[PDB]
Structure formats: C-alpha cells, structure tokens
Amino acid sequence: CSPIVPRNEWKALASECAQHLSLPLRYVVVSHTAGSSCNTPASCQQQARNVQHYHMKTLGWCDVGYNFLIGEDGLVYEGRGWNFTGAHSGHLWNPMSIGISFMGNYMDRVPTPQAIRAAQGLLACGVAQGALRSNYVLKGHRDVQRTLSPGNQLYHLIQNWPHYRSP
C-alpha cells in the first residue's frame, strides 16, 4: 500500500467508535473540510488534530468523521480508516462509503498535485486491498448531501477521475 500516517503519529485522541463497515464498499465520497489547509507534516498533523478536536469535543462524535484526511503536504492521515463507519456524508451514505476529505477549502483553487496524488494512491490501494469494489463509484460530497463541499474547483477535478459518474 501507499504510505498513511498512522493515528498515533499525528497524536490523535483514541477512537470511541464501535461500528464496523461491511466491506467491500461501492462508493467513495470526496469532501473538503472547508477548514484550514496545511502544507508540511508538522502543520498537517496539527490540522488533523484540529479537525478531530472539532468533531469529538465540539460536535461530540466518537472520532474524527472522515475515514482519511488528505494534506497538501502530500500525506494521507489515517482517520477512522478502512474498517470503521465514518461520519462524513449523512446517515445513509456513511455505512456504504469511504469518506476522504481534503483539508482546506477548494471553492476557488485545487489542492496541489502532491495532495491529488496521495488521494489517488489511497483509492488505488483501497481497490487493490479489497476495501472498495474494483468498479466503485466516486461521488462528490455535494452529490449526496446539501453542501458545496468539496468546493467548486475540486469538484470539477474529481468529475474527471476514474470511477466518477453522474449524478
């Protein structure tokens, strides 16, 4: 697989989540956090902690919502991971998708190429390792929830990715 920064490495609080995903999944949903971006390991580790803190302490969720987070440092940050149901795309989508989120707001610009590569590698690993059906469907957050996520420019980008379709 491609490299993922493990939870302990970004100093994540422990998960309190219990719900497991039933693999393999038919969907990936790409979001943006609409929060701050980051472009070094140090700042992106802190940004992952910020998102987690928001989700757990402010919102009361059992863990950071996303299965994975993508930094503009070019690294993937382990969130709930491949096996645990996320909280990213609404109650009906959570159990049937992997939610990956780019840290930042991509309404007006795209993530840097190292971020795009990291996300694409992650999905390729997801397919290789059996988390995702070989023919999975890629969706933008806005395709399944009321939101502009993952941002106009990033949305236009992913509409051209393999596995994108519709809606």
From Swiss-Prot:
GO molecular function, one term: receptor ligand activity
Record family assignment: Belongs to the N-acetylmuramoyl-L-alanine amidase 2 family.
Xref: Gene3D superfamilies: Peptidoglycan recognition protein-like
Task of the protein: Innate immunity protein that plays several important functions in antimicrobial and antitumor defense systems. Acts as a pattern receptor that binds to murein peptidoglycans (PGN) of Gram-positive bacteria and thus provides bactericidal activity. Forms an equimolar complex with heat shock protein HSPA1A and induces programmed cell death through apoptosis and necroptosis in tumor cell lines by activating the TNFR1 receptor on the target cell membrane. In addition, acts in complex with the Ca(2+)-binding protein S100A4 as a chemoattractant able to induce lymphocyte movement.
Subunit structure: Homodimer; disulfide-linked. Interacts with HSPA1A; this interaction forms a cytotoxic complex that is released by lymphokine-activated killer cells. Interacts with HSPBP1; this interaction blocks the cytotoxic activity of the PGLYRP1-HSPA1A complex. Interacts with TNFRSF1A; this interaction is important for cell death induction. Interacts with S100A4; this complex acts as a chemoattractant that promotes lymphocyte movement. Interacts with TREM1.
SMART domains: Ami_2, PGRP
Alphabetized CDD domains for the sequence: PGRP
Tissues in which the protein is found: Highly expressed in bone marrow. Weak expression found in kidney, liver, small intestine, spleen, thymus, peripheral leukocyte, lung, fetal spleen and neutrophils.
Free-text description of this protein's post-translational modifications in UniProt: N-glycosylated. N-glycosylation is required for bactericidal activity.
Keywords: Antibiotic, Antimicrobial, Disulfide bond, Glycoprotein, Immunity, Innate immunity, Pyrrolidone carboxylic acid, Secreted, Signal
Name of protein: Peptidoglycan recognition protein 1
InterPro entries registered for this protein in UniProt: Amidase/PGRP_sf, Amidase_domain, Peptidoglycan_recognition, PGRP, PGRP_domain_met/bac
S-S pairs: 1-125, 17-62, 38-44
GO BP terms, alphabetized: antimicrobial humoral immune response mediated by antimicrobial peptide; biological process involved in interaction with host; defense response to bacterium; defense response to Gram-positive bacterium; detection of bacterium; immune response; innate immune response; killing of cells of another organism
GO cellular component, one term: extracellular region
Source organism superkingdom: Eukaryota
Pfam families named among the record's database cross-references: Amidase_2 (PF01510)
Domain N-acetylmuramoyl-L-alanine amidase intervals: 24-151
Glycan attachment positions: 83
Localization (cell): Secreted; Cytoplasmic granule
